[PDB]
Scaffold this motif. Sequence first.
Motif, PDB file in Angstrom:
ATOM      1  N   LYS B  31       0.960  -1.194  -0.132  1.00  0.00           N
ATOM      2  CA  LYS B  31       0.022   0.065  -0.145  1.00  0.00           C
ATOM      3  C   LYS B  31       0.983   1.358  -0.001  1.00  0.00           C
ATOM      4  O   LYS B  31       0.482   2.219  -0.395  1.00  0.00           O
ATOM      5  CB  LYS B  31      -1.028  -0.209   1.097  1.00  0.00           C
ATOM      6  CG  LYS B  31      -1.856  -1.267   1.238  1.00  0.00           C
ATOM      7  CD  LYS B  31      -2.855  -1.116   2.330  1.00  0.00           C
ATOM      8  CE  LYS B  31      -2.212  -1.199   3.743  1.00  0.00           C
ATOM      9  NZ  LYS B  31      -2.170  -0.064   4.566  1.00  0.00           N
ATOM     10  N   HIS B 104       3.995   0.968  -9.724  1.00  0.00           N
ATOM     11  CA  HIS B 104       2.533   1.561 -10.194  1.00  0.00           C
ATOM     12  C   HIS B 104       1.817   0.397 -10.862  1.00  0.00           C
ATOM     13  O   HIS B 104       0.466   0.307 -10.568  1.00  0.00           O
ATOM     14  CB  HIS B 104       2.638   2.628 -11.140  1.00  0.00           C
ATOM     15  CG  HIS B 104       1.163   3.147 -11.132  1.00  0.00           C
ATOM     16  ND1 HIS B 104       0.976   3.664 -12.433  1.00  0.00           N
ATOM     17  CD2 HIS B 104       0.152   3.292 -10.389  1.00  0.00           C
ATOM     18  CE1 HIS B 104      -0.231   4.044 -12.570  1.00  0.00           C
ATOM     19  NE2 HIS B 104      -0.772   3.920 -11.294  1.00  0.00           N
ATOM     20  N   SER B 108      -1.833  -1.332  -6.452  1.00  0.00           N
ATOM     21  CA  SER B 108      -1.953  -1.261  -4.964  1.00  0.00           C
ATOM     22  C   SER B 108      -1.409  -0.407  -4.112  1.00  0.00           C
ATOM     23  O   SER B 108      -1.998   0.146  -3.035  1.00  0.00           O
ATOM     24  CB  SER B 108      -1.332  -2.840  -4.314  1.00  0.00           C
ATOM     25  OG  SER B 108      -0.168  -2.980  -4.587  1.00  0.00           O
ATOM     26  N   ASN B 110      -0.718   3.248  -3.223  1.00  0.00           N
ATOM     27  CA  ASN B 110      -1.442   4.676  -3.163  1.00  0.00           C
ATOM     28  C   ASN B 110      -0.484   5.769  -2.208  1.00  0.00           C
ATOM     29  O   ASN B 110      -1.088   6.793  -2.287  1.00  0.00           O
ATOM     30  CB  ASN B 110      -2.738   4.706  -2.536  1.00  0.00           C
ATOM     31  CG  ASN B 110      -2.959   3.717  -1.311  1.00  0.00           C
ATOM     32  OD1 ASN B 110      -2.377   4.231  -0.288  1.00  0.00           O
ATOM     33  ND2 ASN B 110      -3.893   2.885  -1.589  1.00  0.00           N
ATOM     34  N   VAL B 111       0.596   5.539  -1.537  1.00  0.00           N
ATOM     35  CA  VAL B 111       1.326   6.460  -1.001  1.00  0.00           C
ATOM     36  C   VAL B 111       2.728   6.380  -1.151  1.00  0.00           C
ATOM     37  O   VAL B 111       3.370   5.362  -1.173  1.00  0.00           O
ATOM     38  CB  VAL B 111       1.066   6.192   0.474  1.00  0.00           C
ATOM     39  CG1 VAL B 111       1.895   7.179   1.380  1.00  0.00           C
ATOM     40  CG2 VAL B 111      -0.483   6.661   0.794  1.00  0.00           C
ATOM     41  N   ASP B 148       0.091  15.860   0.583  1.00  0.00           N
ATOM     42  CA  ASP B 148      -1.407  15.375   1.053  1.00  0.00           C
ATOM     43  C   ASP B 148      -1.324  15.966   2.446  1.00  0.00           C
ATOM     44  O   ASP B 148      -0.407  15.821   3.296  1.00  0.00           O
ATOM     45  CB  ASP B 148      -1.159  13.963   1.172  1.00  0.00           C
ATOM     46  CG  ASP B 148      -2.511  13.488   1.327  1.00  0.00           C
ATOM     47  OD1 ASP B 148      -3.123  13.559   2.898  1.00  0.00           O
ATOM     48  OD2 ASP B 148      -3.565  13.138   0.432  1.00  0.00           O
ATOM     49  N   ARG B 210       2.722  11.559  -8.109  1.00  0.00           N
ATOM     50  CA  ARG B 210       1.458  12.363  -8.555  1.00  0.00           C
ATOM     51  C   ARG B 210       0.911  11.993  -9.568  1.00  0.00           C
ATOM     52  O   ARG B 210      -0.244  11.909  -9.931  1.00  0.00           O
ATOM     53  CB  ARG B 210       1.911  13.890  -7.973  1.00  0.00           C
ATOM     54  CG  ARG B 210       2.106  14.432  -6.615  1.00  0.00           C
ATOM     55  CD  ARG B 210       1.112  14.075  -5.722  1.00  0.00           C
ATOM     56  NE  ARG B 210       0.107  14.594  -5.592  1.00  0.00           N
ATOM     57  CZ  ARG B 210      -1.319  14.348  -5.621  1.00  0.00           C
ATOM     58  NH1 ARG B 210      -1.440  12.911  -5.406  1.00  0.00           N
ATOM     59  NH2 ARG B 210      -2.309  15.200  -5.741  1.00  0.00           N
ATOM     60  N   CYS B 212       1.028   9.318 -11.054  1.00  0.00           N
ATOM     61  CA  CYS B 212       0.432   7.949 -10.833  1.00  0.00           C
ATOM     62  C   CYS B 212      -0.731   8.008 -10.162  1.00  0.00           C
ATOM     63  O   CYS B 212      -1.426   6.840  -9.782  1.00  0.00           O
ATOM     64  CB  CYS B 212       1.391   7.014 -10.217  1.00  0.00           C
ATOM     65  SG  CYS B 212       3.001   6.651 -11.260  1.00  0.00           S
ATOM     66  N   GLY B 213      -0.964   8.887  -9.658  1.00  0.00           N
ATOM     67  CA  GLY B 213      -2.139   9.271  -8.700  1.00  0.00           C
ATOM     68  C   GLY B 213      -2.137   8.891  -7.080  1.00  0.00           C
ATOM     69  O   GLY B 213      -2.908   8.789  -6.211  1.00  0.00           O
ATOM     70  N   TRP B 214      -0.669   8.755  -6.724  1.00  0.00           N
ATOM     71  CA  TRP B 214      -0.275   8.455  -5.235  1.00  0.00           C
ATOM     72  C   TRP B 214      -0.398   9.722  -4.465  1.00  0.00           C
ATOM     73  O   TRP B 214       0.058  10.770  -4.818  1.00  0.00           O
ATOM     74  CB  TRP B 214       1.060   7.897  -5.225  1.00  0.00           C
ATOM     75  CG  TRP B 214       1.156   6.700  -5.986  1.00  0.00           C
ATOM     76  CD1 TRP B 214       0.402   6.191  -6.766  1.00  0.00           C
ATOM     77  CD2 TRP B 214       2.410   5.778  -6.022  1.00  0.00           C
ATOM     78  NE1 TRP B 214       0.771   4.825  -7.355  1.00  0.00           N
ATOM     79  CE2 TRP B 214       2.309   4.855  -6.974  1.00  0.00           C
ATOM     80  CE3 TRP B 214       3.669   6.081  -5.463  1.00  0.00           C
ATOM     81  CZ2 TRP B 214       3.512   3.942  -7.205  1.00  0.00           C
ATOM     82  CZ3 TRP B 214       4.863   5.208  -5.658  1.00  0.00           C
ATOM     83  CH2 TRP B 214       4.573   3.865  -6.567  1.00  0.00           C
ATOM     84  N   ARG B 215      -0.818   9.678  -3.196  1.00  0.00           N
ATOM     85  CA  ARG B 215      -0.584  10.468  -2.071  1.00  0.00           C
ATOM     86  C   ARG B 215       0.934  10.564  -1.955  1.00  0.00           C
ATOM     87  O   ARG B 215       1.663   9.547  -1.964  1.00  0.00           O
ATOM     88  CB  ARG B 215      -1.382  10.100  -0.881  1.00  0.00           C
ATOM     89  CG  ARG B 215      -2.800  10.266  -1.235  1.00  0.00           C
ATOM     90  CD  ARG B 215      -3.860   9.963   0.113  1.00  0.00           C
ATOM     91  NE  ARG B 215      -3.509   8.742   0.604  1.00  0.00           N
ATOM     92  CZ  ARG B 215      -3.693   8.463   1.674  1.00  0.00           C
ATOM     93  NH1 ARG B 215      -3.745   9.313   2.914  1.00  0.00           N
ATOM     94  NH2 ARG B 215      -3.764   7.200   2.499  1.00  0.00           N
TER      95      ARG B 215
END
Lengths: 263, 274, 295
Positions: B31, B104, B108, B110-111, B148, B210, B212-215
């Motif tokens: 995660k 990525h 899974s 996201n951070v 974030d 960012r 990739c959409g991660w925090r």
Amino acid sequence: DINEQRALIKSAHRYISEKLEDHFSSEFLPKALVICGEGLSGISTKIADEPKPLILSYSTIPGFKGELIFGYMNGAPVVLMNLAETVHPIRALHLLGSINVLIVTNAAGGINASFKAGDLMCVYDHINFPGLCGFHPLRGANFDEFGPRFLATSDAYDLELRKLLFSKKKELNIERKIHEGTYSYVHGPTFESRAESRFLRLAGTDAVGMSTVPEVVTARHCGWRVLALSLITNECVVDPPASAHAKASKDVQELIFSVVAEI
Amino acid sequence: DINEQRALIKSAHRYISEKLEDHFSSEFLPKALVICGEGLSGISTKIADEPKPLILSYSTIPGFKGELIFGYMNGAPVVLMNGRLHSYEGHSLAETVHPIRALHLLGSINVLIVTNAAGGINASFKAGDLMCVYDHINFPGLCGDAYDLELRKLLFSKKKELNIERKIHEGTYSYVHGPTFESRAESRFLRLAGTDAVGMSTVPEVVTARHCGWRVLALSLITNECVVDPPASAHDENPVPIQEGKATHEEVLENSAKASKDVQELIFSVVAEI
Amino acid sequence: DINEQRALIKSAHRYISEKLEDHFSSEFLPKALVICGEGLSGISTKIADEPKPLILSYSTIPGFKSGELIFGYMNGAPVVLMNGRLHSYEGHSLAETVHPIRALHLLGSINVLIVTNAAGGINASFKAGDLMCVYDHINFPGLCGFHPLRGANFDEFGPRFLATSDAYDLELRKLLFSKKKELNIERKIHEGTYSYVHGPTFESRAESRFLRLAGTDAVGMSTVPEVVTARHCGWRVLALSLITNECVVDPPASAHDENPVPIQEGKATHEEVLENSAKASKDVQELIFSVVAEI
Ligand SMILES: Nc1nc2c(CN3C[C@H](CO)[C@@H](O)C3)c[nH]c2c(=O)[nH]1
Ligand SMILES: Nc1nc2c(CN3C[C@H](CO)[C@@H](O)C3)c[nH]c2c(=O)[nH]1
């Protein structure tokens, strides 16, 4: 390397000169080159239907990598454009011996606190940030037949052209605000951080974008006058983050449509 | 070229995804990715010895130019990036961020939790302080919402719950290319530009994460206070030596190791609530 | 590639080391490298005709991208002169422009770099004709990725990470002012911060205004990459700028100005730089002549 660059410019001029002669009954010698910015490609509609303008796709012009439009606008013969490769066209068109003014428009984000979305900025100075670092249209062997090895940019934006732009606003009774300020060229995303926007403001930036400046430098190297207009599309957020505890195109259209007449 | 580049990313993911299935009886879906900067390799010990963690060397993973550690930390599945690549080493920005793109493809993560050493530009900073990054200046990117807020509140709450006395500032991180430390005028310039701390890394990984959409949670270890005073004048009869207070790699290493223990515990607490 | 760069470096050194042995009856161990800016080629005259000086063209030296290296004795001291330099705006990489420094370092004798240049004046109290002894610099292109040390580190020359807050040796600057007083040179020698920009354009008004607020006293197109490379090799550095023009920083005339100033007024020219460099050359040559004898 510069030799191939030189031939590609001569090849591109040779092609354009030939098509002009074959197309126009009169010798078409354009006085201006108009670089239509992002979302400002409607300018081609203000080209006169008679004589029939000539349209050249970039695919058919040697060296080019979009279309060139040769026609009349308010009575004046012009060229429309709808790092050395992005300025290869200016050099190719320069060899026509007739162009003496570049008019370039663009979309730009507002950095000056007094700017709002919709306002215009008449560029009278610029900060070429990549040029300071090594991303320069003039890097490499100098094109001696075009301009000098060391070129001054403190005289980039012709005063008479800006005074003409402002007179054509008052004449056209255009209400839209138009400022006079510096344009900063960044090869960086409009996704600028708030700290990046803040640094730009304190750096002396009024509007920011990713265009115009390399073309201004190449035109000035060729000896042309430059008029640059910016459409402030947004206001860059410059406040720090939370602590853990379509109409203006018409005005730009009419402003240019008037200005080209008195060039 | 992007096509042959996309194949390497897919090839790297196919490799890593294969090894995880062989190694872990249960599906391993991390995660968070933790990029350990200067002297934060001790975080590897906070990885639970059960299930047995998987260690993959860069030389063996396609595209990578250091090791990847997959395991559980405070009950959470994570990836540790032990050893990052730097632009000042001659590598391209794409090569330095290829691991993020390859990881990525697991779907899974996201951070991104990333640490690095930094020189203190804010005059009130001292060596030993940390800075929670909440903004950045990408100098190489320009002249050549990202952090974030809830992860930032989480970090400070974990400092209070762990009773860590070490200062944690919040401010703007300036990314410069290096590998030189800043001259006196460059630091004074960075200060007036709004810099709080300056380093030679991190911002490219943040921008790719960012994308990739991660925090993103970024933590800078202030290893030194940047020299800003004008140098000794040739007319000074009692001049301060120009070498006084100069930055060194040894200072960066030593001050990073001293703060490692507090940073490890801060990350250890953070991943559990990620 | 670094391995290709090393062989090029060792090849240039072997070439130079050979021609040094053939030419000089004594072992020629130069103690200073002098990089002469444009208009400062007159420093070659202060090289003694005896012992006979050696001149190697960049065309013959491997790696060196007409420019020439002059090996001889100045004020009795063994020196090497870089008559002409390479610039990034010509299309060369920073590694190419500073490759000569690396090759000469392999002679194991040079511990001082004396580098001169022309520069526009950003500090408003400066005037054309003044000198500026450099005691700090701003390497803005280096901050943004255009850096002479980018790439794998030459571990046999210096550290991976290099401080620059100690770049400009203090005793060498005191010695320069000592020679100015000793020679009764009346020309102003300021002390200030030099800023390296790529060129080849002269600065716009806004660009110069950005340089000023950033701490610039003089802006040029050279020097800093060589200084950084010399520091990486462990040399002490004395840098002397020649103020050839006063950068135009005022905002351009507004369209609403009834009595506007011509935007072309005060514009920088290359002729102006060459001519002002030529006028101050004699002082610069004599300052360097005195300094090399006491390093
Ligand atoms: N630019 C910069 N970076 C750092 C860093 C960050 N890293 C420190 C490490 C060794 O110098 C490199 O990976 C960069 C610590 N202090 C400083 C400083 O004063 N300046
Ligand atoms: N950037 C910059 N460089 C110089 C220089 C140094 N170089 C000297 C030479 C003359 O045109 C160019 O390579 C610039 C002198 N004046 C200036 C100036 O105003 N600006």
